[PDB]
Symmetry: D2
Subunit: 214 residues, 4 copies
């Protein structure tokens, strides 16, 4: 299920034993770049599963080998998964595995530590009546997540239709993000403790890029 | 989360939107064999996740690239996944993705078609302090399922430590099941409505062996 | 590509660098039961790829988003993958991943070290104009492979339409197999050196069952 | 194995039956998005296997459950897989399954649409003694592909150590490609026939971005 920190009204910590367990193996610096990629997919599928408990259902006539029925379906086409380049791509794999019918978008943001112009790629589906789920493993300073969301907010889509998916966040990041977008939900596997002098999340996972790509 | 039927105190129906959705695509007789197989694996992964919400968590020592910590893990070894042959192997695979470190056992009973449990193959991990999770897509008559559980009971393991996982069950099958084993939790994606003359579940999925194997 | 031993006219050793490399990681006793399952799938997909270079092609009208064409296809329905229970199932996964349209069969054989009756499960598709590919990771004594093939030979299908897929074989096994079925091709990742006092392949992979199932 | 076209001395067409077969299912406009994605990943895994036939093999020390040996392995670290963003990420995934231990780099150029190579993102492993394998489904005009390779050339790496992998290429695209880079091996599943007015490959696959991403 779900867990919340007093400072952060829109942060949710998904603390299922198996998310937690799989997270630790990612945390472990002995874990290979292979297994690290898998766990990335795996956790995020699980997280996608918690977030989607309340998806509306409709029906559709389907023929089973025995009978025609009105069988329950979701409107998967109404969702857009938007990995943040480059480390978010492994996450969207897991969500795309969960909900294959979804639209995929992509956002390219340069890693800045303040509010300058940073965007280098935006590729998005049609915006009409559509929920957007962004993902990036790390929310360290919270600037990259803010800017990524900023892209959708510039295009007129409001907080209520936006979500951000992460693995690990630092409280200083969740705070920056919250200030910029208080109405956008942020889902997280763990709210870690602090940032170091080099802006790495502690205890964190180390440098995401290095562990995904060597 | 989970529904229940007034008739069956130890049957749980996992009705998360994406479980229902994915089940529908399996119900559909036009779904290719490629996809039918993947959906078997997927749904049971999700079903596993619901049923493992209450797993005990302890801590291993682990060093991240940054720091050494006491990180949450699970006792995965204390679990036995047991596909009922032949069709249960697909389900086994999804659970194994979820919990890789678990022991795998096998129960073959095509077989005990009606009269008694007839074991063609029973291969099991050690019993001491172990929870067993049996897998089979269909609980039609209930006899296959009850016999599969008999195998374990007749070797000393109490209901308390046994679970059966299926995709679809008929009410007559669940009755037969629970009369033999009132204390064994049976987990299902759907309780369909009835058996036809050939003892197939309606609306159900068809002949599972056929759709998984041609 | 392919390699051959002078003693064995119908044995083929598939010695691609990546098959070989992936084999070593399986050989390694430090390798987990998880990774061991994956590599099992992976090698056998690769092996399936070498075996199938000469599959006949036909055509089929297909519409691309631009044009209708006569596009190349295989008759995947004409092949049957037949894992030998229980350890062969992971292999058929890889072949089924490669050629999803294939029929799946299953053969249950008891591990004997001589020519007694051993068969406990036979489940097969229609035999008409159909090639059968059996698989089991280990060919130690060669009795299990012989008997498994014996099942198809009893049903009238000749050597020319049969194939056996293995990971590792011992020369004493390849010999027993050859004596019983000289016309049946046997594909192998490595022809290891000898059997030990306990009939384990040396250097081999250890006990297949233990490493797949803990 | 591999075909060649008289016009193109460094283009190789991988025409294994299952590569052709799987390509056809991608060509088909009725193939669901779920399946289209998996087939991208699959085909490139197979294409990788053909192109890695000649990999050097050395030996690590390894102990099997039975004995200690000198077992064949590969120098996987000496390889860089570089998806060309955005569509190349699917291909990257298949190669990574094949060779998990390889370094991943990224080249973003939607982009250098015509006039020059315009790098929106270039992230690369270290160059010293490294073979680079670029990935992109389509070589239509040839400009994307030539620019992606320019990126690496302009940073010092010779043709000798560069390869490009695509699903489908137009002859005009290959000409453009080889004029810029006569010494770079380009690997393809098919050389289709021509470009239409909108610069799409005929018969080709359609808009790849669209079919991968909705």
């Amino acid at each position: 299920s779900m867990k919340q920190d007093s400072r952060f009204p829109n942060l949710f910590i998904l603390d299922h034993p198996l998310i937690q367990h799989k997270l630790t193996h990612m945390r472990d610096k002995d874990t290979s770049t292979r297994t690290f990629r898998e766990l990335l997919r795996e956790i995020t599928l699980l997280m996608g599963y918690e977030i989607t408990r309340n998806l509306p259902i409709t029906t559709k006539r389907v023929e089973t080998p025995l009978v025609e029925i009105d069988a329950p379906v979701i409107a998967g086409k109404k969702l857009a998964i938007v990995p943040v380049l480059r480390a978010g791509v492994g996450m969207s794999d897991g969500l795309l595995e969960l909900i294959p019918s979804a639209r995929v978008g992509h956002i390219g943001v340069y890693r800045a530590d303040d509010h300058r112009p940073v965007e280098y790629l935006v590729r998005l589906p049609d915006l009409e009546d559509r929920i957007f789920i962004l993902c990036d493993p790390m929310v360290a300073t919270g600037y990259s997540a803010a800017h990524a969301i900023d892209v959708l907010k510039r295009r007129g889509v409001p907080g209520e239709r936006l979500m951000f998916l992460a693995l690990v966040a630092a409280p200083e990041g969740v705070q920056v993000f919250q200030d910029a977008h208080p109405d956008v939900k942020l889902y997280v596997a763990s709210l870690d403790s602090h940032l170091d002098d080099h802006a790495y999340i502690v205890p964190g996972l180390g440098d995401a890029g290095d562990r995904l790509f060597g």
